[PDB]
Amino acid sequence: YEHVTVIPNTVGVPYKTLVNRPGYSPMVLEMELLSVTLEPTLSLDYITCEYKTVIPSPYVKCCGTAECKDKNLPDYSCKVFTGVYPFMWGGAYCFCDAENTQLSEAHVEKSESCKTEFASAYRAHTASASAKLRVLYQGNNITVTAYANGDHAVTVKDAKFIVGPMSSAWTPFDNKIVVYKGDVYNMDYPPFGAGRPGQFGDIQSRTPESKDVYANTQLVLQRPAAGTVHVPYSQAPSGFKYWLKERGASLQHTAPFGCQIATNPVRAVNCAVGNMPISIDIPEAAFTRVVDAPSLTDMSCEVPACTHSSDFGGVAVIKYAASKKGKCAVHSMTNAVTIREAEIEVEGNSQLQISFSTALASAEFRVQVCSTQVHCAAECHPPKDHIVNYPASHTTLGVQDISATAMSWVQKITGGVGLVVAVAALILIVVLCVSFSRH
């Protein structure tokens, strides 16, 4: 028997689905998502890391004139300064003090540290969504793990489980993401080869090990202090270091829908978005014929207490007369009231106790038990506490129509006004009828 239902993608919340196969006793399956993972396909664009500036000893050529040629190094710069008269610890550098020149050169290379400390710029596509589902099957706690694409069926205990496709394609990751270590950021990183100085991406390479390095640091060589041989320069500080200080919050802290973000691999976990269709192929062995199942009669329900605490604050007691000893499934006939127990045991003349959760100020619901239904109702009280550390076990109140009983005040006022209208209308109709006949 193929049973198809849909549950919310909220993780850590159980849902009850009723399996109705005519000729057989009703069965209730309890399902809970334990984990939902959205894992995007990534394609690396480039690596951003700290750069190092390389400055070979300056060539001091006195009396004559120095010169240099262009090089193809990533951010090469060369300049010759004139009128230089440098000194060393033992005295003036050379014989002549006029018409001297100094040759300075520099270029930018990736730091050795780029193998350990770097940020990866990725392009993100679609996600291979998958989930781990807990199922209560024939009283047994079993789990399955499968991709939420309506494919890759997994069979456990001879029951075939298909999950998905996801009702929503929403992901916390946009098209361009940057992944530092354990942190993932959404940012529009610059095109490879188009990085800017003082900003993230000022130095770029396709892979950490690549020798192909782009750099734009605006490295400018300056004239040395008189009497010295040092090589001064003006260069924008690494945009990587600036970025690390100005990263801000990562998606782990800013993502919508309470998404948890993890890396290695990059994935979003337990996003409370949309819902997930589930299809279960249930073996005939799991079904008991109504003729073999226990039958209950003379059933009645009372509610010793009810509090809409959002944590099964209601309790109900149902009296029954069983034809024979056995087990019976229990299911609510309304969406306003959820019953914690999936099944109960019945024997002879006795009563069963179940717990329930509702948003209703007053509970009015029917409880279905193996081939029987009982109407049950009571007033519910509000909780004393304002805040809890768990999500509500019940659903929302919904559109007004399910409001508290003892609302006869509404009916009395509406009826009183409607009656006045009905009477006034009758008076006018009678007068119009008499007026019509008279000429």
């Binding site: 540290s113 350990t116 200080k245």
Partner: protein, 53 residues
């Protein structure tokens, strides 16, 4: 933490030598708390160090 770095040594003539160079030293924050020393009790996060080798 400081704004300058100075390194020096004692000579063979018992003369002190040192060199001072400007350097902004203010290590990055690891985790979500700013602390000045490692605690007896706490959590562990990824970071980079220099190996003594």
């Amino acid at each position: 933490k400081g704004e300058t770095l100075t390194v020096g040594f004692t000579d063979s003539r018992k003369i002190s030598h040192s060199c001072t160079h400007p350097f902004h030293h203010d290590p990055p924050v690891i985790g979500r708390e700013k602390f000045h020393s490692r605690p007896q009790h706490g959590k562990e996060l990824p970071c980079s160090t220099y190996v003594q080798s």
